[PDB]
Paper text:
PPP1R15A and [name] both formed stable complexes with PP1 (both the PP1A and [name] isoforms were tested) but crystals suited for structural determination only arose from complexes between human [name] and mouse [name]. The [name] peptide could be traced from K639, immediately N-terminal of the RVxF motif (K640VtF in human [name]), through to W662. [name] followed a trajectory along the surface of [name] similar to that traced by the regulatory subunits spinophilin and PNUTS/PPP1R10. As expected, the side chains of V641 and F643 (of the RVxF motif) engage hydrophobic crevices on the backside of the catalytic subunit, an interaction common to PP1 regulatory subunits. From there [name] winds its way through the C-terminal groove to the front of the catalytic subunit. Along this path [name] Y650 occupies a position similar to spinophilin F459 and PNUTS F411 whereas [name] I652 occupies a position similar to spinophilin T461 and PNUTS F413, whose side chains engage the ϕϕ motif binding-site of PP1. The side chain of [name] R658 engages a deep pocket on the PP1 surface, occupying the same position as spinophilin R469 and PNUTS R420 and forming a conserved salt bridge with [name] D71 in the ‘Arg site’, as predicted by Choy and colleagues. The interactions between [name] and [name] were thus confined to residues conserved in all PP1 isoforms, explaining the lack of preference of PPP1R15 for binding different PP1 isoforms. Despite their presence in the crystallized proteins, none of the residues C-terminal to W662 could be assigned in the density maps, suggesting that the C-terminal portion of PPP1R15's functional core is disordered in the binary complex. [name] in these crystals conformed to previous structural determinations of PP1 isoforms (RMS: 0.19–0.29 Å over more than 240 Cα atoms), indicating that the binding of PPP1R15 did not change PP1's structure.
Reversible phosphorylation of the alpha subunit of translation initiation factor 2 (eIF2a) is pivotal to control of global rates of protein synthesis and to modulating mRNA-specific translation in eukaryotes. In animal cells, eIF2a phosphorylation is reversed by cellular phosphatase complexes consisting of a protein phosphatase 1 catalytic subunit (PP1) and a substrate-specific regulatory subunit. An RVxF motif, common to many PP1 binding proteins, is present in the conserved functional core of the PPP1R15 family members and their viral counterparts, and plays an important role in assembly of the active holophosphatase complex. Our studies reveal the essential role of a third cellular factor, G-actin, in endowing the complex with substrate specificity and provide the first glimpse at the structure of a ternary holophosphatase complex possessing such substrate specificity.
Residue numbers in the entry:
A (entry chain A): 6 to 300
B (entry chain B): 639 to 654
Write the structure that this text describes.
């Protein structure tokens, strides 16, 4: 039995502190977030059907104080509805605080707050790129395994008002009907290839015609006509995805038929990129707020 | 409905 309000209050009370200040929840509280959110994820569709207005965010990668700023400008739940597109953990310094706040809001406002799976919500990846280390350092191995079982139940994609298709990575040459996504059973790991892999790993590329081998070493690239055909077959207007660092936080592809969102400013302290959040209003007019890193 | 886009982008700076 969670005291979700107590947990959220403690996560938010570090706002305004010198960036880097930790929240040390109890191990049992973090475990509780995982157990309860897993129930909620499994009870909801794996392909979400969402109604605007809402705000959509891309990668966070453990940049907790940047997540707090997103909420400060976007409005704290449930003032605004949110959809996050994955990659909550790794690389940044506070993956635990980040995923704990997101899971806590999912539990408190399960029909106003939504989280998709990214490719870093996968044990084979986040064992290496920082999350496992953070868990072992601050708590224990067992807690990391608990997060893994929770992540294995995240939904994979969302459609906003039957017009905006959202996922972390991108399209799949295997994908012909949305029913294929719906029939993916959870819990599941992410396979090294195939539909689920592509949805979390693939990228648009302006120089490819059709499908190409992705330079990442996983999945594919796809071109602008693949996007156009996808939108026409499924009666969609827009693909909204994340997964790539883009300099202004958002970046259009294929004459605004696809948009990439990335919400971790100055990623890894290397890229000097902005982070963006896309607001979708009830008429599906999309607008962008960006957080630009300054000295 | 139909997706449209606002031309005006809102920018915030994050010092530090
Ligand atoms: Mn990422
Ligand atoms: Mn990614």
């Amino acid at each position: 039995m969670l005291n979700i309000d107590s947990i959220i209050q403690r996560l938010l009370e570090v706002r305004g502190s010198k960036p880097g200040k930790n929240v040390q929840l109890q191990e049992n509280e973090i475990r509780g977030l995982c157990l309860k959110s897993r129930e909620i994820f499994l009870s909801q569709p794996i392909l979400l059907e969402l109604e605007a207005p809402l705000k959509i965010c891309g990668d966070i990668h453990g940049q907790y104080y940047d997540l707090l700023r997103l909420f400060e400008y976007g409005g704290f739940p449930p003032e605004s509805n949110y959809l996050f597109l994955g990659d909550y953990v790794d690389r940044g310094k506070q993956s635990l605080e980040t995923i704990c706040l997101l899971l806590a809001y999912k539990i408190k406002y399960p029909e106003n707050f939504f989280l998709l799976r990214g490719n870093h919500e996968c044990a084979s990846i986040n064992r290496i790129y920082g999350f496992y280390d953070e868990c072992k350092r601050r708590y224990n191995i067992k807690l990391w395994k608990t997060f893994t079982d929770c992540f294995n139940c995240l939904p994979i994609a969302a459609i906003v008002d039957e017009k905006i298709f959202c996922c972390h990575g991108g399209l799949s040459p295997d994908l012909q009907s949305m029913e294929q996504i719906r029939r993916i059973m959870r819990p599941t790991d992410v396979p090294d290839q195939g539909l689920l892999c592509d949805l979390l790993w693939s990228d648009p590329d302006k120089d490819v015609l059709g499908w190409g081998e992705n330079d990442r070493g996983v999945s594919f690239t796809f071109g602008a006509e693949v996007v156009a055909k996808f939108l026409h077959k499924h009666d969609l207007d827009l693909i909204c995805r994340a997964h790539q660092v883009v300099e202004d936080g958002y970046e259009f592809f294929a004459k605004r038929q696809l948009v990439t969102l990335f919400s971790a400013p100055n990623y890894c302290g290397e890229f000097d990129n902005a982070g963006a959040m896309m607001s979708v209003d009830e008429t599906l007019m999309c607008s962008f707020q960006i957080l630009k890193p300054a000295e | 409905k139909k997706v449209t886009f606002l031309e005006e982008v809102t920018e915030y700076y994050i010092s530090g």
